[PDB]
Structures are given as structure tokens and as C-alpha cells.
Structure 1
């Protein structure tokens, strides 16, 4: 749990800018132009290059791959899944690839002054690590920052709301807002602990003159309007827990009182792009579907019936009966502790003071969303 000696000064500035609200001069547009993205090859990355199509001069995608040929292939294959060949071609007109070495994130020679940098930062999770592939992530972040100052660019670092959504039991205050950096939340996973440390590394650099901001995204799901497909959905924690859950008709008490959001990818992408254009004093933003619902009223809309409650004890029985495996273990791992009350108000003002609000979920949409999750795991 290593926190900088000057954490006090960090928290002091995010709160300083938080209580600035929206200044009259603040709401105004600054163009992106030459943007450098890392996250293509990934989920949010692909929908990010579709969402800043037209607000940006040229998109320079930095991809770790052994040559230019392979990096293009890795990227095009990605986009080809989410969109039509017609819409991918035009997207492909104003965009270039920056083949980068996997071992070293050094000596990167870029061909123009990048005024905007968005870091989504997928890391090779399939390669073995002793929690050491999670320190090279922070290295992978601190290397982007170094390049951000060198160009005098606006850095946008995409983090996760999970960076402060889990709290220890028996803690008095548990709220988490765009003003909170560290509050004693527990960083369970090594992924979370890394997206946390980069948030800190981006913070202490924003103190030293750099223009940068952190966008905390929620659990990303298939877009509102787009293809339901999501690459590597087989390994996403959220979606696979839903399929193990949609074969039953009873649901736990502590289990089904839990919230579930549908932060659509295309909306998260659209919002992040709107956020990078308006200069606005805050440093941390929460881009998250505010339409959270309990799992109860979600299974009442997928089965059209009423699901009935059982105890957690009698649940564990019916769970092992079908070899629940990992879905059970991350289900009781969210029940064992306290769940942070996420404040998203200050961002909700802005991201609807200029952009769109979040699309209202519709009952048939989920039925379709249900069917996709059902079919893919069989």
C-alpha cells in the first residue's frame, strides 16, 4: 500500500479544483487535432477511434507489435469486428500506426507535435507475472506522462471506478466522489492497484504544470447502438457471472441487493471525447451510467416474472450443485466487504451541460442483451 509522501498535497488540489465548479469562461471548445491513442486493440479503444472521428485531425495509434505490418493487422482486425467494412474504410483514411517495442517504452520517436494524448493502456495479461506485470503498467503510464510534458499536450488518462468501489467492513464513511483520491478503500485486484497508482502518477505530474485529467469509467458493456459483439467476452468478469445467473429462478439477499450498471461503450466513448474538448478546471471525472439498478429488478425484466429470495446459506448449496467455479468466488468476494456509494454528480452536470445524457435502457434491449450472453457461453 505505497502512497507518496506528498499525498496530502495531491488531495488538496483535486478538491481545490472540484470546488471550482464550472466557471463561466470554462465551457468553451479547444480542438484535439493530432491525438495519440494507446487503447486500440482493446474494447474502449476501438469505440474511441470511432467516437473522435471528425473531431480530430489525424489519430496516431501506438501499438506494441513486432513491426508495422503486424500492428496494422492487429488494429484492423479489431475494428472489423465492431463495425462494417464500409465504415472502417473511411475511419482508416486519417489514422496512422506507431509500432512500438514491447520490452522498452523508451526512445519513442514521434512524427508531429501531439496536442492530445488518451491512454487506455491494455497490458498483456496472458503472460505470467509475480504481480510484476502490474508495475510495468505504472511504468507504461509514467512513460506516457513523460511524453506528454515533452510535447506540451493535454493528457487524458482513462481509469476505472473500481479504483475505489470496494471498502473494508466496519468503516464509518464510505462515499466516493470525483473529489476523492485516497480514502482507505481496498485495492483488491492487481489490475485495480495499478490503475490506482497511475492515477497517482498522473496526479503528481498535473501538479507540476501539466494539463491532464482522469476519467474513471464504469463496467463497460455492449454499446447502445452497435454490434452486440465484444472481443474476449469469454474473459470479462461481469458478463460471465450474468450467464451463470440467468439459468436460475431464485437469488440471494446480499447477492441481489447489489447494483449493476450498463455503462455502454459507445456512450462512454462519446462522453470521453466531449470531455477532452472542453477545457474545464476539474481533474477527476466519473463517466458512468447513473441509471444503476438492483439485480432484482433486472431479472424481473428478463424473465418477466418475479424472482424470489433465498438466504445466502441456502444459496451456496444450489451454487456448488452446478459447479459454479469462478462466478461463485467473485460473487461472494463482493458480498464479503462493504460497497462504496459512488457520487457522480459534478461530472453529470458537465457531461450533460454540453453533451448528451445517458440513453434510457429499454426492456427489450436487455432481452436481446440477455440472449447474446446466453448464446455465447454455449
Structure 2
């Protein structure tokens, strides 16, 4: 064992908290929270307990400082960045400059053809498969692991029936081709090299905002590199990467070096804050995709936003409990209050069926149209959301900052888990400058407008979650 006795009284307190939270007889000062039985959700209880003792910490602190020794150095005052900065972005930026309304409008659209879809079992991927079945003519190969099933074919069929009213089982074997595979193993791509594949759509991703190890980089970066290598083995395979709008994460940390910076579909790197592991992995994937483009691969990067329930019927993902936006809303409901900054925060409600439709449409844009901001441009505020929630009788109120604090102080328990796992800190009290209009315009030219996230849609959404007593 690495058992080291704590020295200072602060270290003793943090060791004792670890041991009480995890129910471990003896915890040393160099015990890794996540190695000794801690999980990401128990980390939020850890944070709540440290806040109850009057320490100033937030959720990412326990991921960056995993032992009581490190946590005490933090609370008392004592390679990805190099990968990001050690790069010549000239050629990528030159390609980005071609991504204009003019080149979309003047260019020749590309054919989708037969699709290799990764991530078909996740929330986005299943709906891409749904829309492909419903609106496209070709074949779709879906790469997935067998999981708890006898075959990946049975697993895909089960997920399809989980999410759809229609039974599209009878298309499995004709339009839908299940492929046993894992994007993190490059050899799993070899079995596809003799298949008529025209477009790869890479929606497989690990979308945890905070993780204790580097598997997120294996799925989100190495898997993209492997898919790009597969695409490069032929001269006619488009590679469409599903990305996140969050790569435009902040104002430049070095404004002197990036003056008059815009944050649009022609922007990749401007020394924005890339410390978060998920944003960082997606950024590195984008850079790999555009690099391959500088070598001649046809590519698209489709940045998506706040992936929400279907417009048609309000159905959300199977693992409804893990969404950060919704858990923040849950906390607001539990406290029955939000302060004015919270109330005013705008959000896209990108309905997953329309996200998938928009991905399929943008995949057909001309070769120079490389990067899109595919999210619902009719932003709502948390007053809109709370107006919808209060029709259930929850009585949620917009309160002033001081009152919100009093209510927050009085709820140092499970009720604030939501905002805690979203890296909230009561002291925390740019995105308005992200532009998406070009993509709006292009989508409109393609026949696509976003449906408004009106009260009825929000009620559909909340009705679905209420079937699980989500707010209970």
C-alpha cells in the first residue's frame, strides 16, 4: 500500500472526509480518490462535504487533484497544451477561409451515398440512422460492439426498438448492415475496405465533461484518427466528424496574438481555454480532420450544441439521468429558485431528430463547405424553461442574487448535485459572440429551418421525463 499518514490538520480533515464518503476504514493522504473506489458522482458528494466545512472548491478540483495531499495543497495555496500550441495552423486556416456563403452557393453539392455510421447506439447516432432510413436511398453500415448481446446485430435491433415507434428490423440485412467493431481498434476498419462506402459519419464519442483518466482521448481522438486513416485508404470517401460548439470555448487567453477575433464557422484555434478534457479532445479531433483535408481528404466538421429531446414526441436519451443541462434544471426545480444570471442564460434546444436531419443535409454541401454550426438558432432562456416547468405546479421563482445564496446555503445536499457536477461555484457570479448565421442560411437554402422550442415542445419534453419521476 501507498499508505502515508496525513501531516497537517487540513490533510487530516480531507482524509477523514474521503473515508466517510467512501466508507473505507483507512484512507492515506496519497490515496487516489478514483483508485480507491470513488466515482464521478461520489466526487460531487465529496465537493458538497468540503463546501459544508466552509472550503472553496469546485467539481473539477477533485479531478485535477485526486489525493488529500494535493487537495490540501490546493485549499491552502501551494502535455495537451504543448500538443495544442506546437502546430502550424496556416494551411488549416487557409482552408477555413474557403468556408463561405459564396462557396456553398456556387459549389456543386456532394452525394451522400452509402454511409459508415459510428456511434449508432448513442442518442445522436440512433437518430442519424433513423433519418437515414427515412430520407436517404443508400445503405448504412453501423459499427458497434456486441455488448451484453449475442451479436452486434441483436444489440442494434434492440436499441432501434427502444427508440422507435416504427419497427425497422426488416431492413437489417438489406439497408442496415451491422458491423462488429470499435473505432479505437484500427484493425476493425480493415473488414470494411472492400465495402461500397461513400461517407463516414463519426458520431461515436465519450461525452463526459470530467473524467479521471485518458480513455476519453482514445475514443474522441484516436478513434477519429483511425476513421480518417480508413477514409484515406480510398480516394472517394468523405469523412464527416460530429463535433461540439464548445471548442469555441472562451475569449482568447492571448488577445495580443489574435486581434479582432471572430467566433464562427471559419474559426479553429485562437488560444482559447482548452483545459477541459472533453473540449480538448474534440478540438484535437477537429484539427486532425482539417489536417487530412489539407492533404486532400474531403471532410466536414458539424459542431452541434445542446442535444435535446425529439421535437415530435419529447423522447430523450436512454440514460436520461446524465445530462448536465437537464440536471442543472433539476437543481433549479429542487431549490425552487434561480438567480437573475441563471434566469437570463440563453440556450439552444437542438431537438435530436432535427439535429440528425441537419447532419444529413449538411453532409451533401460542396467540398469547400467544411465547418458548420448545426444548432437551433431560436434560443430560449431559463425563464422560458421555468415557465414551462411551473405548469406542473413546481412554483419555481426568479430571486435576487442574495436570496439565491441563502437558498443555496440551506441546500448543501443532494439537491445541488446538478449544479455541482456542472462545475458551479457560488462565486462564479462570451458565448453571446458565437456566430451560427452562416449555417442557418445554408440549412435554409437546403430546405431546413429549426422548429421553435415553444411551450408545447417543452411540455412534451418534460412530460417524458416526468414519466420517470425525473424531478422527484
With normalisation by structure 1, the TM-score equals 0.88
CA-CA distance at 1:337 after TM superposition: 8.8
Answer 1 or 2: which has greater strand percent.
1
Show structure 2 runs of 5+ residues with no match: 1-80
The equivalent residue for 1:80 is 161
Structure 1 CA distance, aligned partners of 2:227 and 2:427? 36
Does 116-125 or 42-51 show the bigger shift?
116-125
Q: Give the root-mean-square deviation of aligned CA atoms.
A: 3.1
Asked if the contact 1:154/1:212 (under 8 Å) is kept, the reply is yes
Compared CA separation, residues 77 and 166, structure 1 to 2 (3 A): farther
Which protein is richer in helix relative to its size? 2
* Equivalent position to 1:365, from 457, 464, 467: 457
Q: Distance in 2 between matches of 1:109 and 1:90?
A: 24
Which residue of 1 is the match for residue 380 of structure 2? Answer: 293
What does residue range 203-222 of structure 1 map to in structure 2 within 5 Å? Answer: 203-222=290-309
- Render the CA deviation track for 1:349-378: whole Å, top value 9, x for unaligned: 111101220112332221232333342343
> Is structure 2 residue 392 aligned with structure 1 residue 308?
no
**Residues 351/40 of structure 1: CA separation in 2 closer, same or farther (3 Å cut):** same
Paired residue secondary structure (2:114)? strand
Q: 1:109 to 1:333 in 2, by over 3 A?
A: farther
- What secondary structure sits across from 2:242 in the alignment? strand
Aligned to 1:6: 88
1:282 aligns with 2:282: no
In structure 2, the CA distance between the partners of 1:340 and 1:188, relative to structure 1 (3 Å rule), is: farther
- What does residue 155 of structure 1 align with? 239
Is the counterpart of residue 49 in structure 1 residue 143 in structure 2? no
- Spell out, residue by residue over 1:243-266, the C-alpha distance to the aligned partner (whole angstroms, 9 max, x if none): 222244432122222112210000
The 5 Å alignment of 1:239-278 reads 239-278=326-365
TM-score of the superposition, structure 2-length normalised? 0.71
- Quote how far apart the aligned CAs of 1:303 are: 2.4
Instruction: Name the CA distance, whole Å, in 1 between partners of 2:426 and 2:205.
Output: 24
Larger radius of gyration: 2
Within 2, Cα distance between the matches of 1:288 and 1:170?
Answer: 28
The answer for the alignment partner of 1:71 in structure 2 is 152
- Which shifted more, 100-109 or 72-81? 100-109
Deviation at 1:340, TM superposition (A): 5.2
Q: Which residue of 1 aligns with 2:191?
A: 109
In structure 1, C-alpha distance between the alignment counterparts of 2:240 and 2:427, rounded to whole Å: 33
After superposition, residues 119-268 of structure 1 pair within 5 angstroms as 119-123=202-206, 130-152=213-235, 153-167=237-251, 175-226=262-313, 228-268=315-355
SS in 2 for 1:326: helix
Residues 132 and 247 from structure 1, CA distance in 2 versus in 1: closer, same or farther, beyond 3 angstroms?
A: closer
Per-residue CA deviation, residues 36-95 of structure 1 (Å, 9 max, x unaligned), is 0002110110000111114142111111347994312322222112102x4322543411
Kindly provide the CA deviation profile for residues 122-154 of structure 1, in whole angstroms up to 9, marking residues without a partner as x.
34969x852344245311110000111112301
Instruction: Confirm or deny that 1:327 pairs with 2:422.
Output: no
Structure 1 position 105, deviation (Å): 2.1
Q: Distance in 2 between matches of 1:261 and 1:239?
A: 13
Most deviating of 45-54 and 56-65: 56-65
Deviation readout 1:158-184 (Å, 9 max, x if unpaired): 001112144479978675211110122
Matching residue of 2:407: 318
Q: Distance in 1 between matches of 2:146 and 2:246?
A: 29
Distance in 1 (CA, whole Å) between partners of 2:112 and 2:167 is 22
- Residues 337 and 327 (structure 1 numbering): CA distance in 2 closer, same or farther, change over 3 Å? same
1:89 corresponding residue in structure 2 = 169
Q: Does the 8 A contact of 1:252 with 1:309 survive in 2?
A: yes
Quote the Cα distance in structure 1 between the aligned partners of 2:429 and 2:317.
Answer: 30
Partner deviation per Cα, 1:106-127 (whole Å, 9 max, x = no partner): 262214131111001134969x
What residue in structure 2 maps to residue 376 of structure 1? 470
Distance 1:194 1:214, change over 3 A: same
Structure 1 gap segments, 5+ residues each: none
Q: CA deviation at 1:19?
A: 6.5
Distance 1:145 1:345 in 2: 29
Mapped to 2, the partners of 1:211 and 1:235 lie a distance apart of 34
- Give the distance between the partners of 1:231 and 1:273, measured in 2 at CA: 23
The answer to whether the 8 A contact 1:165-1:342 is kept is: no
How far apart, CA to CA, are the structure 1 residues paired with 2:471 and 2:145? Answer: 30
How far did residue 348 of structure 1 move? 0.9
Residues 309-366 of structure 1, C-alpha deviations (whole Å, 9 max, x = no match): 311x442331243323432222636983953522011111111101220112332221
